[PDB]
Every structure is written in structure tokens, then in C-alpha cells.
Design a protein around this ligand. Sequence first.
Ligand SMILES: [Mg+2]
Lengths: 181, 182
Amino acid sequence: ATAQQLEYLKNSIKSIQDYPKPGILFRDVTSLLEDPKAYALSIDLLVERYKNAGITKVVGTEARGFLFGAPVALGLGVGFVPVRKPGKLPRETISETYDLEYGTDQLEIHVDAIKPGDKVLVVDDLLATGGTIEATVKLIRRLGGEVADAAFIINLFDLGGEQRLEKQGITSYSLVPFPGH
Amino acid sequence: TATAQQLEYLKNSIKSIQDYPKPGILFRDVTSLLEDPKAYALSIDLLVERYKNAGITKVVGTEARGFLFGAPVALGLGVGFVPVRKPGKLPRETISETYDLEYGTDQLEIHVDAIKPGDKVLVVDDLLATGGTIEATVKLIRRLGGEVADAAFIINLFDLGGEQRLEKQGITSYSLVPFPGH
Ligand SMILES: [Mg+2]
């Protein structure tokens, strides 16, 4: 990606001051979704980055993740595998629990969607704590899939998500870096 | 339009789960279509081709299946994508519409600035059942001044009356894979 393209993407994202609370800047990707060039550029750049990586499956967590993982899967010509909260996926699944501020939650994946030997690319809209991605990586590996890459539109470099994923052997690629918690 | 062979390939890419989520109903699982790169790409390409000359200016998809099918269609048409979401997810100003579910009601929201007078919208979703969420989505779009007369689906459970319900709103539904049953 060129300096000009990265600048275009950064400017396509709206930042909401003091939301959800004072001192925090909400990075709203819906403004990027609304803009034809910005959305297409974001997908095209991710596809270009992984076109020669031998990816056989793209995994995306519900829901905003779907907006980027699915188009990347189509661009790479590989199947898309959703990871969701319990109660949505209809076929056999395995689950992983992840931590939240005042509690925990779970993510599930179809057991038959990832086969031993698959090389997986995880795609999400924004990298913050990295908790959901950490759980997703564990799901993929429990099914024998290989995953060493995670791609994001936005990276909140202040929250330590990139380092957390590196502890799992994951290299993160992000298009737009933003500060703040 | 789609060839019989293409429609057949799409129909065969969808897994049917007997007696799920409860006995008597034959579920149609679109996730197996998502897993097949050929079926997924074909379905998106066909929807784009169907509406390429319809003057569409925005594609709306509800959380989260509508993301999976509506977003790629928006990209194929080269127009903006607008998400309709569950309550409290969208960060900017929104309007809401209530719709019925088996055990009650719920709401769908849309950003007020996402649709403007003059916009011609295409709604895309994975499956047409009762049509409740799409009916609510059409109301949201029109409250913002958008014009919507088209809804596209991967699957249409024609025995559930969704298509007729949407026709009462002036919506013409286009579906790739029709299936019988509840
Ligand atoms: Mg293609």
C-alpha cells in the first residue's frame, strides 16, 4: 500500500469524540463502508497482501468482521468460515471462552469447516485487545488448521493486541493505525 | 439471467438439516454455500448482474447474514453499503423499527445519514422466511427518503409467505434458491 492509499483510508473513517464515554474516540468504519472507493481499496489491499500466501480459508468473527473477511475470501477465491456466538451455527461446533471486562463470552466454529492442512487467514475490522482473535486461533488449531496471519482494517496500537497475537505466533497486518483506548 | 445449471449448482451447495432447530422442519444451511468458493462467488456475481442496470445507489444488509451477501453485492455494483443492525451497535444517530419474532419482538436500526432522498436501495439477505426483518428494513429506508422496490435473497422458503408480505409493500423479491417446507 502506498502512502497515498493509506492516507485515503485513514481519512475515510469517522472518529466520534467522547464515545462511548469522555476521553474515548470511537473509530466508525461505517463511513468507510458507505464510500465505494474506500471500501473497495481496503479489500483490494488485503487481497493483494495474501494472494501468494497459500490461504485456503478465510475466517471472520461476527459481525463487523464479516464485512471484511467475506470480500477478502471472495477476492482470494477461497471459502469463508464464520465464527459466531453460541446459538447461531446449525451444524456441529466446538467452542472457546474469552474474557471481557465484567465476565466472559464464547465463540464457536463449525467442526467441518476447517480441515487438517488448511492454511487460514483471520480477518476482522479492528484490532483492540485481541481477545476474540486469540480464541479464534485456538478454534482453528483444534481442528488441525494452520494459522499464522490476521488482517485488520484498524489497529488500535495502544491496546496491545498485536503483541498478544504474536504470543500465539500470529503476524498482524493492519491498514489504519489509531491511538487511544 | 442465471442458467438452470448455475441455479442447480447453488441449490446443491446448500446443506439441509433434518428436524432442526426442531422436529418437522427441514433447515436450509447457507453456511455450506459460504464454504464453497465457487458457490459463494457465483451467488454474488449473479445478484450483481441482476441489478447492474437498476440504478441502485446503495445496498442495505441486516446484521449479520446481510453483511455476508449484501456487502459483496455493494462492492460488485460499486455503490456504498449500509448496515442495518441490532439495537445499540451503530455509534451515530439512528432511527428504529420493531418487528415480530416467534417469541416476541425486537428492533432494527439504521444510521439516519446513511440514506438520503434520491437514493435507490437494494436490500440483500441470506434467506426469506416470514419477511419480518425485511419489512422493517423497508420502513427504515423509506423513513429516510430512500426508494426501495427490490429485495434479493440466496434462499426463499416460499411456503412461509415472505414474498407476498413484501409485495404488499411494493417490493419485488428475487431469490436464487427456492425451497419448500416450514
Ligand atoms: Mg470473481
